[PDB]
Design a protein around this ligand. Structure first.
Ligand code: FAD
Ligand code: TSS
Length: 436
């Protein structure tokens, strides 16, 4: 009777939560697989994370699921190396990773400025805008100003040199999964607050520990708890939402009546659904503007064992590339993040070779793979990231129709499964509370 649209983490956890409360539900998934933008798949001779992959015990919702489904000890840290390669001014620079992390640490210290006054409770991101905010009016003028500034301009204005500017350019090409210059600096500042305002903790939480058994160990766990079969290959085309319940029409014309709808379809894919009545103009504006998730994630296999770390600013095909697995077949698997999905074919060896050639001439690519989420009709975006203005006038606007998903979370929004687990569960609680 409650229809959940989408069988990603948010819809799976919402279903389990409704099941706990004894509330009847049905999950409709457009694809022939569950997991959504988390997708552990058999590629290049390894289970590979085609979507998300890193976790941490400081992510409350993700960690509780890790504990629930037996993965407590099944995490492995990504490998480290001694040297990094970077491109500052149309030239490749090689230096120690220690020297790299010092420059990045100093830049993040400037990027985080204000986060202690903005986010004393980092799960209350809009507290500065609240009615009883008790800080100075200056802190109220800097918060709104930061929503309209990108994270690179904060570093340029502090007088950092071009090398550091190019390093943070590359960093946020990966972090903002697209063009960082159109992004909102407050995203970066909230990441810092959730990470005790320390760059090393931020990296520990988002880019260190991998699930040995993949995200699949978690989303199959949740689905394995459900007492109602997920309806795969059942795309939703129309949602009618009134005061008395709602109606959902599938792509095939099947009409489902429902007391409520929990819609986990990401912003990049909401255009496939006709909403009757139409969504509010403020929400439609965000849907038109889309995310800042125009990038891509690649997996590259090269000959030999090489501990590699490369940074390249926009418009590089890939901005951050790092070794992740050393195969017993004398090869290394690297992961890369790039700002523009249309400038790279994730499955073309020549394009992957062009990526490695950004920094080196002695490394040979033998395979490459990736799923282009932006060109995936049911996603339309990688992980959700914020354009200018979307920290205070974006994700919070989505409020018997409820939107749930990582892109609307209070905490680790968009970038982490933690946000999907948070918002799926709390949205189910909204439905539970209304029926009680
Ligand atoms: C490349 C990439 C790497 C990532 N790496 C990490 C990482 O290392 N760590 C981490 O914690 N997080 C990571 N994430 C983030 C994580 O994948 C997401 O935050 C989380 O999976 C989002 O879940 P969701 O349920 O909110 O949305 P989704 O997973 O997008 O679920 C929505 C579901 O709705 C379905 N759907 C869409 N339209 C319709 C329709 N019309 N009818 C029916 N069903 C429909 C979709 O097929 C999908 O199954 C990554 C994301 C990406 C894209
Ligand atoms: N696949 C993990 C995506 C990610 C989360 N945080 C990041 C920071 C920089 C680059 C990628 C990421």
């Amino acid at each position: 009777k409650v229809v959940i649209i989408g069988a990603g983490f948010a819809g799976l956890v919402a279903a389990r939560e409704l099941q706990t409360a004894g509330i009847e539900y049905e999950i409709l998934e457009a694809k022939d697989r569950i997991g959504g933008r988390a997708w552990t798949e058999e590629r290049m001779g390894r289970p590979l994370e085609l979507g998300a992959t890193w976790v941490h015990w400081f992510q409350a919702h993700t960690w509780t699921e890790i504990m629930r489904y037996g993965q407590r000890t099944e995490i492995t840290a990504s490998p480290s190396g001694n040297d990094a390669h970077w491109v500052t001014d149309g030239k490749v620079v090689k230096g120690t990773e220690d020297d790299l992390d010092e420059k990045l640490t100093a830049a993040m210290g400037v990027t985080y400025e204000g986060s202690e006054e903005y986010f004393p409770n980092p799960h209350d991101p809009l507290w500065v805008l609240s009615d009883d905010f008790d800080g100075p009016a200056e802190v109220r003028e800097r918060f709104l100003s930061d929503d309209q500034t990108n994270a690179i301009d904060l570093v340029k204005e502090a007088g950092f040199d071009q090398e550091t500017i190019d390093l943070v350019d590359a960093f946020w090409c990966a972090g903002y999964i697209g063009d960082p210059y159109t992004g909102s600096a407050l995203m970066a500042k909230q990441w810092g607050a959730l990470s005790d305002n320390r760059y090393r903790v931020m990296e520990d939480i988002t880019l260190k520990w991998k699930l040995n058994n993949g995200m699949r160990s978690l989303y199959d766990g949740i689905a394995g708890d459900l007492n109602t079969d997920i309806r795969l290959n059942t795309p939703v085309a129309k949602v009618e939402h009134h005061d008395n319940g709602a109606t959902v029409t599938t792509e095939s014309g099947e009409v489902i009546e429902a007391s409520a709808v929990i819609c986990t379809v990401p912003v990049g894919a909401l255009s496939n659904i006709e909403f009757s009545p139409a969504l509010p103009d403020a929400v439609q504006s965000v849907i038109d503007d889309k995310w800042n998730s125009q990038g891509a994630k690649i997996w590259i296999k090269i000959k030999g064992h090489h501990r590699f770390l490369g940074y390249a600013p926009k418009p590089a095909k890939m901005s951050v590339v790092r070794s992740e697995y050393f195969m017993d077949d004398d090869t290394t698997i690297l992961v890369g993040f790039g700002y523009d999905n249309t400038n790279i074919d994730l499955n073309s060896i020549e394009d992957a070779q062009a990526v490695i050639n950004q920094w080196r001439d002695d490394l040979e690519v033998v395979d490459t793979t990736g799923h282009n989420w932006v060109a995936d009709k049911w996603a339309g975006q990688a992980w959700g990231t914020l354009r200018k203005g979307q920290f205070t006038q974006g994700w919070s606007l989505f409020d018997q129709l409820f939107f749930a998903g990582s892109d609307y979370a209070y905490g680790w929004r968009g970038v982490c499964v933690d946000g999907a687990l948070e918002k799926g569960m709390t949205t189910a609680r909204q439905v539970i509370n209304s029926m009680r």
